């Protein structure tokens, strides 16, 4: 069956839903990273049926302000008087760049989760990472996590918590693999399209050769890869060094001292014993930084291997047509 | 006292350890079906054996340089128990390479090579890395002994390397572990003398502070040392014949002298002739073509005085460096260039980085079973 | 890859068709509507694909693959360093 872990179930997305996420596409606000709106959907055969999703449209530009309750109030009273209700089983984001966690939606992540079990994270990934394996990523977040919800914090919570070991490179739920039975109207416009209309699928194909003459791709790509790992580990490795400057290097000259003034005085305190160790800021464990890090570069590899697999089958396709 | 004693409470042991082999596994499949399925661990059988070689070895030198002609240790070792390990059957699992690695071990210290293509034609079994290290390390002695530089400086640069995908662990590299990497090091460090011009294949197994310890030595030697020749072949002897371990330094004994001294003989008229060639082997062939003049100017760098120079360049060209043609009648010298090139080892670091980081990612994995 | 056997799929409904195609002509009589109308699709893929044919080129090729062999290297290396700080900070 389609059980993972928990109560939850492997995702089933409609087409449908796809073609109305691309209506409202990736423009009109190219770099803003604007969290496009939510998934609804219900539970159903071995798996969970998304059937649906609306926008969510903020106050964009290059800025993109937060929006009023009425708007997902009076969309969800108007969706249930079409079809069914609002049953809300995930949310979903493109938004500009090739696949990344922007921190503060690992916490509305883990917010949605602790309410709600039964939900998928979508990313949507197509000709801004190169369109391109793994387009569509479909993410649940730990139960080990979510049980010791809330909170993080900064050291505190964190270096407990962390220190009973939760997983966070975690369960991504497998979308299309058989019919879903509603494929039979667009199977009956696919035999006339085709037919007397192949100048539009023709077209659709010609606009391919444009793109790939024109584009940079690869390079562009790398360049805003070489990019981001750069930003990213070099946040991580300065992170890194202030905690271990802290943990060791202050605590070595400590001892260092501590030993040299010999450290116990029998008839009263022990006054400067009593002033010694006091916690730094970070004593321990910034794992909200650090995990939030990892699955950043763990985004960063995805698009280094789905670079490196656009590279070999057009190095063994540009070698294959030369030769003969 | 002590030391002797130790070799004779060895030897007992192994000849009591040989006679029970001899008698046992032939038949004896209830004492090792019983040895198949109780035990949980696996690892000890292998180790014993090597063990047992690398004690051998070192009694066997020390009873050899002490008597030095007539005395019973080659023939007993050779005779019952060597050639009764090598003839019967192996115990199911890489047991019959252990025990051929040790005959093969025993046939180099004794120099009496050639068998090597039945030992390799019966040793059809599967190369599980531990028996791919060992087959190496032999098989490059083999090559350097068969005077086959180009073969043999692969099969020691696999193995100095290390990357031969071991996962050892439960100490079976074993107490010799930097000295046998040395060993090795040594005689690519030879080999690397022999074939430089041509390699551009030293980085993979020598690391850049001893390519530039070595590359001085080397361009030293092929322009003026003697210092160079006697602090190599000092290094190395020591390193060839592998004697495991000496005795103890005192006027009285000659014995171990003797030793010592067909030693040093055997490998310094082989390595004096192949050190002569890699100074002919030097010079750089700078262009393909030479009319008369630059013939001549190359005479002068041979050889001067004056008188016999065109005969010897004869037999310094034909000892192997130069193929060529002559014109009588043109005057010109004709002969090719040997080249060679680059970017081949970065094909096997691409399959090797994939390999480390995948080891990586089994260990953190396999750590956090264990916090479940 | 997918589209790498559609295109495969298509190559050899190609090779059928203009088997085919010649062998109208062969027969009787035939090819007059794919004449030099099917004559400028082969010259129009031929000029594209591969471009020009001489042997300072294909060089250029074989050179350009690997260097997209070396920077396909590299990311394995970028991928393995980043395993190797991953590795030191999950202990």
Known sequence: GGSGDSAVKQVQIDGLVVLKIIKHYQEEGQGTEVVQGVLLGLVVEDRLEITNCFPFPQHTEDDADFDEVQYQMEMMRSLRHVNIDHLHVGWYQSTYYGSFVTRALLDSQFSYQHAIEESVVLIYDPIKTAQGSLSLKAYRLTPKLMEVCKEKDFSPEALKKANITFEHMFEEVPIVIKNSHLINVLMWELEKKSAVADKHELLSLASSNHLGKNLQLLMDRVDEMSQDIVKYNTYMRNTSKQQQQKHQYQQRRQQENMQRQSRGEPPLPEEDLSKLFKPPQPPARMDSLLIAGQINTYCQNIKEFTAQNLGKLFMAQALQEYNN | ?372 | SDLQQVGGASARIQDALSTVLQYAEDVLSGKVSADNTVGRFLMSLVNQVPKIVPDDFETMLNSNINDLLMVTYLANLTQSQIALNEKLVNL
Request: hydrophobic share 40%; net charge neutral.
């Open chain 2, 1 to 372: 006292q002590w030391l002797w004693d130790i070799i004779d409470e060895f030897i007992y042991q192994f000849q009591s350890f040989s006679q029970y082999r001899c008698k046992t596994a032939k038949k004896s499949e209830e004492e090792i079906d019983f040895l198949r399925s109780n035990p949980k661990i696996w690892n000890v059988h292998s180790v014993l054996n090597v063990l047992h070689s690398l004690v051998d070895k070192s009694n066997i030198n020390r009873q050899l340089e002490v008597y030095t002609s007539g005395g019973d240790p080659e023939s007993v070792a050779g005779e019952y128990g060597r050639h009764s390990l090598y003839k019967m059957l192996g115990y199911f699992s890489l047991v019959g390479l252990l025990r051929l690695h040790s005959l093969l071990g025993d046939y180099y210290q004794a120099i009496k090579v050639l068998e090597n293509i039945e030992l390799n034609k019966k040793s059809m079994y599967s190369r599980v890395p531990e028996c791919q290290v060992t087959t190496y390390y032999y098989v490059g002695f083999a090559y350097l002994m068969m005077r086959r530089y180009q073969d043999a400086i692969r099969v020691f640069a696999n193995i100095l390397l290390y990357i031969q995908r071991t996962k050892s662990m439960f100490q079976r590299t074993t107490y010799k572990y930097e000295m046998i990497n040395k060993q090795n090091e040594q005689m690519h460090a030879l080999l690397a003398i022999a074939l430089t011009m041509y390699p551009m294949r030293i980085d993979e197994s020598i690391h850049l502070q001893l390519r530039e310890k070595y590359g001085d030595k080397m361009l030293r030697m092929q322009k003026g040392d003697p210092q160079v020749y006697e602090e190599l072949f000092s290094y190395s002897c020591p390193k060839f014949l592998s004697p495991v371990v000496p005795n103890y330094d005192s006027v009285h004994p000659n014995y171990h002298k003797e030793p010592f001294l067909q030693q040093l003989k055997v490998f310094s008229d082989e390595v004096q002739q192949q050190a002569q060639l890699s100074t002919i082997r030097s010079f750089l062939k700078l262009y393909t073509t030479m009319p008369v003049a630059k013939l001549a100017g190359f005479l002068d760098l041979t050889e001067q005085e004056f008188r016999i120079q065109l005969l010897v360049f004869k037999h310094k060209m034909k000892n192997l460096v130069w193929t060529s043609g002559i014109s009588a009648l043109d005057g010109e010298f004709q002969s090719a260039s040997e080249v060679d090139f680059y970017i081949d080892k970065d094909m096997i670091h691409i399959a090797d980085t994939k390999v480390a980081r995948r080891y990586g990612d089994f260990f953190i994995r396999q750590i956090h079973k264990f916090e479940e």
